[PDB]
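Re-running the complex after MR caught last week's input typo. The corrected sequence lines follow. Everything else is unchanged.
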Amino acid sequence: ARYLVVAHRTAKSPELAAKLKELLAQDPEARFVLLVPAVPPPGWVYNEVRRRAEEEAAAAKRALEAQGIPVEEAKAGDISPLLAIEEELLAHPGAYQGIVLSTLPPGLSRWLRLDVHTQAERFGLPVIHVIA
Amino acid sequence: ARYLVVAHRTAKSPELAAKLKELLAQDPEARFVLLVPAVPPPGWVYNEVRRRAEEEAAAAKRALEAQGIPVEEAKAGDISPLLAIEEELLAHPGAYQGIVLSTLPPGLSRWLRLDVHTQAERFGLPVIHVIA
Amino acid sequence: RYLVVAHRTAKSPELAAKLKELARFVLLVPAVPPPGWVYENEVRRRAEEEAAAAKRALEAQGIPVEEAKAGDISPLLAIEEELLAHPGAYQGIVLSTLPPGLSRWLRLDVHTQAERFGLPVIHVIAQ
Amino acid sequence: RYLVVAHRTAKSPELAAKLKELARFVLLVPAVPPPGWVYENEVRRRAEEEAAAAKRALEAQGIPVEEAKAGDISPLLAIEEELLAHPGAYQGIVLSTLPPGLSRWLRLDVHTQAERFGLPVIHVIAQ
Amino acid sequence: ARYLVVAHRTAKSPELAAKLKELLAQDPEARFVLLVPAVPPPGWVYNEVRRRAEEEAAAAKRALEAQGIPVEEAKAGDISPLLAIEEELLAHPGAYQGIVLSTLPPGLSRWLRLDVHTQAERFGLPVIHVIA
Amino acid sequence: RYLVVAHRTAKSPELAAKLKELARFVLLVPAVPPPGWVYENEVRRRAEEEAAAAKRALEAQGIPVEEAKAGDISPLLAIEEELLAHPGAYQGIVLSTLPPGLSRWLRLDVHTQAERFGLPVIHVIAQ
Amino acid sequence: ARYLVVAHRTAKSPELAAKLKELLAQDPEARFVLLVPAVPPPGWVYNEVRRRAEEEAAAAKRALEAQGIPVEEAKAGDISPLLAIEEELLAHPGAYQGIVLSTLPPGLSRWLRLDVHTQAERFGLPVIHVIA
Amino acid sequence: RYLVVAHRTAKSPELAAKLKELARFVLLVPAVPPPGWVYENEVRRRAEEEAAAAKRALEAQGIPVEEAKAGDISPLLAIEEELLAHPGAYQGIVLSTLPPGLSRWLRLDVHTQAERFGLPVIHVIAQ
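Corrected-run output:
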C-alpha cells in the first residue's frame, strides 16, 4: 500500500526508479514516502541544521520525481538510516506496509558497511533492498 | 491443519481476519486456537488474576468471531507471548502445524520491540507474522 | 543511584544482602500489563499498588528506597522506558531474578539482554 | 595513546574525570555527514570546525589534546577509518556517550560493536 | 540425488514417510541414507555400546521401510545429531545433496530444544525439516 | 552448593585440583539417552550405574559428593532439567570437559551456552 | 548482469559449470569474472608470491573455460575468500550484481568450515552458493 | 604450555614483551595454503621454511621456542587442526596480530572466534 523509501544519494538512480516502477506495476495504487537520513545531532557550532536537512530532502524528492516516480512526501530524518526508520515508524505507526531501502553499491555504501540492510528487518516490516 | 493464533489487542483487526480468511481459502478444514498472552506472574497484592485473564481471552475470542472467523478455543497464557507459546506447545505437542503471530504495527507493538516475530522461530514451527 | 529491578524477589534476603554490600536505590517493578478488552487506568492502578507492596517488602529488609515505580510487565521494556523518562539518573542496574528453573525473566534472557542499554548490570539470584 | 571518541560529551565532567584517572589523547569527533545534493568541501569544513570546538571544550576541562580530527558521522565508521589511516597509533579507545535514554550511539550499539576492531574499549557515560 | 535422513524415534512417523514420498515424486531416482543418532560416548561401565546402537539403527531402518520408503543404508552415529551429521559428512564428502532432519513436535523434541533445526544449516547443505 | 557436570573427566586430576581450590558438590552426569526401538527403564538403569561409577571416581580423588544424578545425555538439557527439578539448590556450575580436540561438549559449545541459565559457570579442562 | 564467481579448486567442477550454464539460460548476456582466492600475506622468506597466485588464477580460468563457460577475466585475490570479495567490491563498486560462491563439499571444504557461505551475505549482494 | 599464533609479528617487540611477562611456547604459523593447479608438497615445504624463519625471529628476541609448526593459512583452521593433533598439550593460546587497520586476522575476527575452542585466549597487538 504505502512504502517508506529510504534514500538520499541514490534518489536519482535508475535502479531505485525501476524497483518503484515494478511496485507500481504490481500495485497501481502504491504510495511512496521518501525518508532522507540527513539530520545530524546537535553540536557546538551550528534550526539551521534542520533547514539544511530539509533542503537536502526536497532536492532528493525532486531527483526521484524527475525519474517518473510519484512521491507523496519527503521527510528529513536522523542521519542514521536505522534511527530515522525507528523514529518515523514511532511517529506514524501503521502508515507503512514496507520499507524500500536504497543503497549505494557494496564497496561504496556506508549503510551496507553498517549492516543497515539486515538490521532494518528488526522493526517487523518487510524490507526490499535495492542496490544503486 | 491447526494454527496457534497468538493475539490479544489485535483480535478485532481486519488484517488478522484477512490472513485467517486466506488460510481458510487454501485449506477449508483449517482450525484456529486463539492463545491470548494475558496472565501476569504472582504478586504481593492480587485465582482472581487468572479469572481476569480468562475474561480477556473470552473477549478476544468474541472479537475474532465477530469478524467471521471460526475459533475452536481461546486460551489465556503467560503475558509474555514467547513464554505463552513455549508453554502451550509443551502442554499440547503436535497439536499445531503453524503459529500465526498477530502484532500491532511497528512503532506501537510491544512484541515487535521484544523481537517476538523472529524469536518465535526457535520453537521449530512455521511462523506467519501479521501486522494489524 | 541504582535502578533495582525486582517484583517477587523484593522480600528476598539475597537482594537485601547484595544491596547491603553496595548509594541511593530506585525500585522499578515490572507489573503493568498492556491494555485489554475488559479492564488502562484500572490495570495501572493495580500495578502501582503492586509496586508499593514490593517497596514495603524491600524497606522491611533494611533498605531505604527513594521511590518505587510500576513499569511495563516486560522487564526489558520497563528498563528502556525508565531510562528514557529519567536519563542520567542511574549509574547502574541491579537485576533481581528468581533462581533458574523458576525465573521467567531468566527464560526471557533479561540478564543478558539488559546489558544493551549501556549501564553496568549486577545480577542477583533470589529465593 | 588513546583514541577518544566524543562530540557532544567533550565538555562533560564524567569524561574529564575518566581521562584524569588514566598518556596521550587524540579526539575523534564523528561529525562528517556523507555528500548531498545541496552542500563535500562545505560539510567537511563545518565538521572540522565542530571538531575544533569539541577540542577546546575538552582542553578547558584540564585535558591536553594532541590532535582533534573530524571523522564520519557514524562513530563505528569513523573509528574504522581512523585506525586505517594511522595503524598502531592507538593502544585503546575511550568511548564517551550521552546517558542511555538520550544517546544515539548507545541506541546504535556503538559501545558493544566498537570491540570488533581489536582494541580495548573504555566506555564513559556523560551528562 | 542422495539425502541424509536424520531420524531415530520418528522413523515410523507418517510425516517423515510423506516428505520422502514427496521427494520421490519430484525425483524418482532419489536415494535415502538413514543416519541414526544413537552412539553415546565411552563411559566407566559399558563394542557393546556400538552393538546396541547398530541394533537401534537397524530397527529404525525396518520401521522406515515398512512405511513404503526405500532405504539405501542405515548408520548409527553420535548421539548428538549435530555431531553425527558433521562426522558423516567428513566420512563421505559429496555423497549427500541434502539433509532431511526429522524431529518430534515442538514441546516434545530434544533436538528442537537444542536448536538442531537451525544449527544444521552451518554445514553448507540444504536442510529440509520435518515435524513428526 | 555447586552443580558439577562431568562424566568421563570425573577421575581427572584437573577437576579434583579445581574442586580443592574451591562448599557442597552435586555431580550431574549427562548419560541418559532418549528412548529407542530395542531398549527406557533399561537405558536409565545403565545411566544411573554410569553416574554411580563417576561418583566413585571423583570421591576417590578426595572430593566429597553429596549426590550423583544421571541426566539427559545432552549436558545442556541435563543442566536445564536439573535446575527445573531443584530450583535454588545451586549457586554455580562447574563444567568439566575433555580438552579441545577431544571434547564433544566443547564442539557443542556447551561451555558458552551454559551461561544462558543465569548461574556463574566455572570451566575446567581435564585430561 | 555481471557475476563475481569465487572459486579456485572447484574451477574444473561440473556443478559450477552447470550453475553458470543455468545463469546463461536465464540471461544469455551474463558475464562472469573469476575471483581466485590465492594470494597469501607477506612473509619472511618469499612479487614472486603474486606471480605464483596469478599463475593459479590463469590455470583456474582455463579450467573453467574448458567446461564451455565464457570467462571475462580471472583475478587472484587474498587467500581468504571473504577478504578477497570485500577487496574486489571495494576496487570495483557496482561492477557486480551477484556473487557465485563455489565450494568443495561439506566435509572437505575449508570455506564452509569458515562459514564463508553465510558470511558472504554481509556485503549486500545476492549470493548463489554452489557445492562442487 | 602456550600455543603462540603468529607469523609476521614473530619479530615484534610487543609479542616478546608479552611472552616475557608470562612456561613453554609452541609457535603455530598459519602459512599453508590449500592445494592448487600449478604448485601440495611444494607449498607445504615453502610454508615450513616460513615457520622456521618466524621461529628464528622469535628466538632472536630472547624467547625459547619448543617447536614451530606450519599450519593452515586460516589461523582459525590452523588452531583447530593443531588442537586435534595434540589434544591437552596447550593450556592457552597467545594470539599475536598486526594492529587494527593492518591486521587481516582482526578483519576475520580471529580474536573473538578463537575463544570457541575452549581455551583462554591472550591477544597481543604488535607493530
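None of the earlier attempt is carried over here. Chain A touches chain D at residues 8-9, 11, 38, 40-46, 52, 55-56, 59-60, 63, 78-80, 82-83, 86, 110, 113-114 (CB under 8 Å). The helical segments of chain A are 14-26, 48-65, 81-91, 110-113, 116-119.
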